[PDB]
C-alpha cells in the first residue's frame, strides 16, 4: 500500500509566532491562500536553529529566516533561496539595561555574559572583538534561543543580541511595569559596531527549498501573490488587521505584543522585493565572518514576484535616520505611520 | 556534491505548546535525546487539522495525535501508526457555562452554537443527535480550532468540545477573573453521551509515519527510551520538571498553565503502552461514525517500547471512578497525586 497525496505546503516560521508574522497568518485567516487554491500548513519552530536544515534538506517546503542564516544555509549544503522580504533591516544590537556597567563603548562588554540566539550571533560578536582591542575570551557567550530579553530581565545574562521592535520593546515594557525608566533599555547597534551602514544582515526573508521551487513554480508565485494581498491589507488597515490576527492567535492580543506590532510596522517590506545592495553587503560581511566562501553567490531571487520592482535607494543613510526618528517617536505615541520615501 | 544530509527528525505536536507536552520538551531540554544520539526538531502546528496529513504523507516524521484522528488518518490513506501513549483517557465533553440554558441533558443543546476543533468533533456530535431525539440540523456546529474555550467566554459560541484539564480549566479560571463561581464551568461528558464508558477516543498518542518506522526502527526505539526517561523524571518530580519546562517556554510559567498541568498530571501514561481494549472500543466507534471502513484494523504497535507491558487493568470502571474523584479534588486542592494502580 502507498500513501495518499497531500497538497499541503509546509511553511516554517523563523521564530515562535510573533507580531511581524501577521502577513502569513492573515493570508490564511482571510482566505487569501484559499483564493489561490493553496493549502498552507503554518508551523512554528521550538528551536529557531532548526529552520534552515529543515527547509534546505527539503523536510519543510518554505519558511522564514534572516539574511545571515539564509546565506549560510546554502554554504553549508542546505539549498534554500530567498524568494522575498518580510521585515526590512530591523535595528539589531546588543541589548542591555542602563546602569549595569554596560555603555555605548564596546569595551564595557569585558567580563560580561552576552546572550545570543542560535549560532551566528556568537560568531558576529567574536569577530567584533578584534576591532576593539579584545578577544573572544574577553566575554562569555551564552546561547539563549528565543529568551534573550527574558534572561536579561531575570539577570542570568548581562545583555544579549536582539531586535529593536521585539527584544528592546520587551525590555522597555518590563522596565515600566517595575517603575523603572524605559529609556534604560538600550542597545549597541551591531551594524554600527561592524561598520556596515545598516541592519541589512537582519532582514527577515521568505525562503524556499530549491527543489520545491523547481517543482512548484506556480505555487511559489501564487503564495507570494497571497502574501502581497495580505501585506497590502495590513499596511492599509493595521488596527483592523492586528485585531484579526489576535482573534486567531490570542497571544497577540496582549498590550506587549500590540506595542511590538506598532514598532514593527515601519519595517515591513511593502513590495516583498529582495534589495540587491543589501544582499551584496551582507554577502561580503559573511565572507569577513568566515561563514561564506570567497566568490560565494547570494542565494536570492525576485523571479517569483508578480508586480513592479521599486527603484533602488541611493541614500539609505538618510532613510535610516528617518527610521531612527520614527522609532524613537513610537516610544511616546500610539498609532501607525509609514515612512515616506525620498 | 554540495548538498548535505540532515539527521534532524521532525516531531509535530498535536496542538500549540501545552502543559501535557512536557515529556517531549523535557527530553530535549535535559539532553535525553542527545544522550541517545537523536536530534529532534520539535514543531508546533498553527492548525491541528494539518497534523495527520503531514505525518502520514511523510512530510513530517513523527508527532502527536488523539486516537480518533490517528485511526482516521490511515483509513484515509495517510499511513501513520501509534507507537505509544502520552495522555490516557482525558475527560472530554461539551463544555459550557451554567446559566446559559445548557444542562446535563443533551436536548438542551437544541438551537445552540457548538464549537468543535477541526473535523471529527462535528461528526461525533452529529452522530449523537439521533440518540437524543434530534438531528444534525438541530444545532449549528462552528469550527474553532484551538480557541473553543476562548470563544465560549467571548460569547461567539454557546458551548464546545474540550478537554477537562485544558478547556474546562480555562473556563474555571476566567470565571474567577469575573468574580464568579468557577463551578459554573461544566461539561456534558462525551464518553457518557456516546455510551463509550471512558474517554478512550481522546487518548493522545505518539505517532509516526509508517515509512519512517520501517526505515528507522532503531531511532524510533531510542526516541521512546528518551521519552520514557523524561516521563519517569516528570512523574517523580513534577514541580521541578514543570519549572524547567517553563524556563524554556515562558507561557508555561503562568498560574493558568500550572493549574492545567496539575489537572493533566493524573492522566499521563507511565508506561507509554497502547491500551488494547481502548483501541478495540474506539475502532468500533469509528466504524459507527462511518469514518472507518467495516474491516478496518487498528493502527498501533507496542513493539518499539523497551520495558515490560503492564497487565490489563482488572476493573476499568473502578479506575474511572477514582479518576472522577481525583479530578474533583484537584480542582479545589491542586497538588500532584498519581492514582494507585490495581
From Swiss-Prot, chains A, B:
Its EC number is 2.-.-.-. Pathway: Cofactor biosynthesis; thiamine diphosphate biosynthesis. Pyridoxal 5'-phosphate binds at residues 118-121. One of its GO terms (biological process) is thiamine biosynthetic process. Disulfide bonds: none annotated. GO terms for molecular function: 4-amino-5-hydroxymethyl-2-methylpyrimidine phosphate synthase activity from histidine and PLP; metal ion binding. Its cofactor is Fe(3+). A motif (CCCFC) lies at residues 198-202. Keywords: Iron, Metal-binding, Pyridoxal phosphate, Thiamine biosynthesis, Transferase. It holds the Pfam family NMT1. It catalyses: N(6)-(pyridoxal phosphate)-L-lysyl-[4-amino-5-hydroxymethyl-2-methylpyrimidine phosphate synthase] + L-histidyl-[4-amino-5-hydroxymethyl-2-methylpyrimidine phosphate synthase] + 2 Fe(3+) + 4 H2O = L-lysyl-[4-amino-5-hydroxymethyl-2-methylpyrimidine phosphate synthase] + (2S)-2-amino-5-hydroxy-4-oxopentanoyl-[4-amino-5-hydroxymethyl-2-methylpyrimidine phosphate synthase] + 4-amino-2-methyl-5-(phosphooxymethyl)pyrimidine + 3-oxopropanoate + 2 Fe(2+) + 2 H(+). The modification N6-(pyridoxal phosphate)lysine is found at residue 65. The active site is at 69. CDD domains: PBP2_THI5. SUPFAM superfamilies: Periplasmic binding protein-like II. Belongs to the NMT1/THI5 family. Responsible for the formation of the pyrimidine heterocycle in the thiamine biosynthesis pathway. Catalyzes the formation of hydroxymethylpyrimidine phosphate (HMP-P) from histidine and pyridoxal phosphate (PLP). The protein uses PLP and the active site histidine to form HMP-P, generating an inactive enzyme. The enzyme can only undergo a single turnover, which suggests it is a suicide enzyme. Homodimer. This is 4-amino-5-hydroxymethyl-2-methylpyrimidine phosphate synthase. It comes from Candida albicans (strain WO-1).
